């Protein structure tokens, strides 16, 4: 097993971002606990306080063409969601898969996902999905 690395969900976004480090923590009077995180490739202006249970987890992993078969329907995926204004990684679920015929070099499978945020759906290739460990 490799050393655990993490991603965290931004409150000004709802997308998930690789975490560079955890600076400190705090406990609100409600009892709510939060850690302060630094996002990889970002200066300290972008640091956030996030809940550990809902907004921090093990990094999603890009899936190799060779293992597309491990991905299944109903699965949770970190999906690179391309739009005009923003391109970002959001959670989604696999509604359907159309399998394809391909060598390990490249995957031509088609995954239909439902984004958790809005419930909207999009079809994605392997290149835009990551799997949970």
């Amino acid at each position: 097993s490799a050393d655990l690395a993490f991603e965290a969900k931004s409150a000004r976004d709802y997308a998930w971002y690789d975490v560079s480090s955890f600076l400190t923590y705090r406990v609100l009077r409600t009892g709510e606990l939060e850690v302060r995180v630094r996002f990889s490739g970002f200066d300290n202006r972008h640091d956030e306080w996030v809940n550990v249970k809902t907004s921090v987890r093990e990094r999603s992993i890009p899936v190799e063409p060779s293992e597309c078969g491990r991905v299944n329907v109903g699965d949770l995926l970190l999906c690179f969601q391309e739009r005009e204004d923003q391109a970002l990684y959001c959670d989604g679920h696999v509604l359907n898969i159309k399998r394809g015929i391909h060598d390990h070099a490249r995957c031509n499978c088609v995954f239909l996902v439902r984004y958790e945020l809005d419930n909207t759906e999009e079809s994605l290739g392997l290149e835009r999905i990551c799997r949970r460990p």
Partner: peptide
Amino acid sequence: TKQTARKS
């Protein structure tokens, strides 16, 4: 590696 995200 992941796709290079671009923020709003």
